[model samples]
Target: MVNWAAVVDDFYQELFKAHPEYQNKFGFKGVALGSLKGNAAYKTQAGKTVDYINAFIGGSADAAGLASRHKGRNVGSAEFHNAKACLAKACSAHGAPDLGHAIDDILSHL
Candidate 1:
C-alpha cells in the first residue's frame, strides 16, 4: 500500500538534483515522474530499487556508492548502503520487478 508514483517522483527528483551531470551522460534527465503512469519503465525502476536495497542489506557498501553515483553524489560506504536499502524497499513496494533485477546486475557491475 505505498504511493508508487510519489515514491518514483521523489526518487527521480532527488536523483536529478544530486547528479545533474548524468543528465548529459544518460542523454536525458532523471526518470520522469509521470513516466511511471502506465509506462513500462515504471516497473523497471521498481525492480532496481529493490535490488539496490537488497545489496545494501547484504552488506555491499559499494552498492550504496553506486546508487549515489547515479545521483551524482559522493556518499560514504555506509550511507550508500543505507540508501540502497531504502530505495530497494521503495522500488519493490512500488512493483518494479525488472528494475529489481537491473539493480542486481548493476551492483554486480555487469
Candidate 2:
C-alpha cells in the first residue's frame, strides 16, 4: 500500500514551499502545522483532503459539506483543480506517476 502519511505531507509541503505566495488558498494558511491534531479547520483542510480523495476513489460521498464550507470562503472547484494538478506533478516527480494520475482523475471527478 502507498504510504499516504508521506504522500499527503509531501503534497502540502511542496505546495507551500513552491508557492508560498498562494498560502492563502490553504484552509489553514498561516497556521502552524504543529499541534493541529485537534484543530477542526486544520484537519478539515489538511487531513480532510486525503479523505475526499479516498472517498472519490472508493465511490463514496464526502465532499458536499466541505464544498459548502470552502465556497463560503471563496475556495471553490478551481482551487481543488489547481491543487490536484500540483499534487499530480509532485507525485510524478517523486517516482509515482501512476499515483499522480489516479489522484488527479479521482479528485477532479469530485
Candidate 3:
C-alpha cells in the first residue's frame, strides 16, 4: 500500500521544478503531499479514493512512456489522442460512476 498522495505530490513538485515555464503558466505553485491523506473527503471515501489514485497513477505512467517514445512529434495529434484516452480512463476510474465521485478533482496538466 504505497502512499499515493505522496507519490503524486512528489511527482508534481519534480514536474514544477523541471518545467518552471509550464508551472508558471499553469499557476502550479506546489502541493502538500500528506495533507490530502488527512482531508475530510479522503477520510470519508478512503477505499474509492485509493483505487482511483492507483488507477490514475498507473495510467499517467503509461501516457508518459508513450510521450517519451513519440517525443518531438506533432502536438495535438496522435500522441494527444492516446494521452487523452489514458486520462479519460483514469478519470473514469477515479470518478467511479457506479459508486460516487470520490475525488472532487484531479489537477494534472501535460
Candidate 4:
C-alpha cells in the first residue's frame, strides 16, 4: 500500500491548485492554499485526508460511512469524480502512479 501520509498534504495542495474554487467551499476565501502547506490548519485537514485514503487503500472504507461523513457537505457525484481525478493526478506527480480505479469505483457509487 502507498504510504498516503507522505503525500496527502501535497495532494490537498494540488487539489486546490486544480480547482481553486474549492477554497471557497472549504472557507479559505482568497488565501492561497499552497501557502498554508505546513500550517496547523492545513495539516489537520490533510491528516484526515490521509486516514481516509489509507482506509480506502486498505479496503476498510465503507460506502455508508463515507456518505454519512459528507452528509451535509453538498458534495455530489460531480465533486466526487473531480476529486478522484485530482487525486490520481497528484499520485502520479508524486511518482506513485495508479489510476485509483478502486477508490473511484467506491466513490462513484456514493
Candidate 5:
C-alpha cells in the first residue's frame, strides 16, 4: 500500500542528485528537483514508467507497447536496466526492497 507518486518523485530526485550528467540521456538536462517537481514532461514520463512497473508487477503490463514507445525514444535494454536499477535503489530507501527486486525480475523479460 505505497503511494507511487512519492516513489516516482524519489526515483527522479535520487537519479539526478547522484548523476546530474545523466539528465542528458533523458532530455531533461539541468532540470533540478525544484524545477522538475511541476514539469509536465517529467510527470508524464514518470507516470508512464510507474504505470509500466505497476502493470508488470500486477500481471497486466503490455510488454510490446512498452518496448515500442521506448524504442521510439531510443531506449534499449541497457537503458531499461539502468532505470530499474535506479528505481530499485529508490524503493530500497522506502522499505520496499523486495518490491524493487520483484519489479527487476518481472521487467527483465521485456
Candidate 6:
C-alpha cells in the first residue's frame, strides 16, 4: 500500500533542477521523462514507475521482462544501473532509511 510517489517526489523535483539535462537521456520511444513540468504526463509516468516498484516488491516483476522491453527500445541495463546510483542518492536525501533499506533489500535479493 506504500505509495512510493509520495516518498520520492522531492527527489525527482531536485533531480530535474539539479540535472535538467538528464531528462533528455534514456526514455521510451521519444518520450523523454525529464522534458515535462509538474504536469499530467510527469505524474502519470511517476505513477507507472511506482506501480512497477510495487509490482516488483510483490514478486510480479522481473529484470528479464524489463530487459526485453528496454531492449526493444535500444536501451540497456547500464543506463538503468546508472540510474540506481541516482536513486540511492535520492533515497538518502529523502531521509528515509527504512525505505532505503527496503530498496537495498530488494537490490540484494535481485
Q: lDDT values of the candidates?
A: 0.50, 0.60, 0.38, 0.68, 0.69, 0.55
- Greater TM-score among 2 and 4 belongs to 4
Task: Specify the highest-TM-score model's number.
Answer: 4
TM-scores vs. true structure, each candidate: 0.34, 0.57, 0.31, 0.77, 0.71, 0.60
Instruction: Report the C-alpha lDDT of model 5 over 1-110, residue by residue, as the tens digit.
Output: 67676777788887677667667766456676788867777878788767866776698876766676667767667756666777877787777644555444535555
Candidate 6: give the clashing pairs. none
Q: What is the per-residue lDDT of model 4 for residues 1-110, given as tens digits with 9 covering 90 to 100? A: 66676567666776778777776766445666657764666667777778777666677767566765665676666766777777777787778756476556657557
Better of 1 and 6 by TM-score: 6
Error of 4 at 10 (Å): 2.7
Per lDDT, the best of the predicted structures is: 5
User: Cα deviation in Å at residue 109, candidate 2?
Assistant: 9.2
Ten residues in a row with the worst lDDT in model 3?
99-108
Per-residue C-alpha lDDT of model 3 across residues 1-110, encoded as one tens digit per residue: 54544434343334334444433332222323345344554344444434555665455334343334335333324334443344344434444322112221221212
Residue 10, candidate 5: alpha-carbon lDDT: 82
RMSD of each: 8.5, 4.4, 12.7, 2.5, 3.0, 4.9
Q: By TM-score, rank the candidates, best first.
A: 4, 5, 6, 2, 1, 3
Q: Which regions of candidate 2 are displaced past 4 Å?
A: 25-28, 31-44, 62-66, 93-110
Ranking 3 against 5 by TM-score, winner: 5
Window of ten residues with lowest summed lDDT in model 5: 97-106
Which consecutive 10 residues in model 6 have the weakest lDDT in total? 25-34
lDDT of 6 by residue, 11-77 (tens): 5655555556555543422344455434665677677767766776677766566666656766554
Cand. 3 Cα-lDDT: 0.38
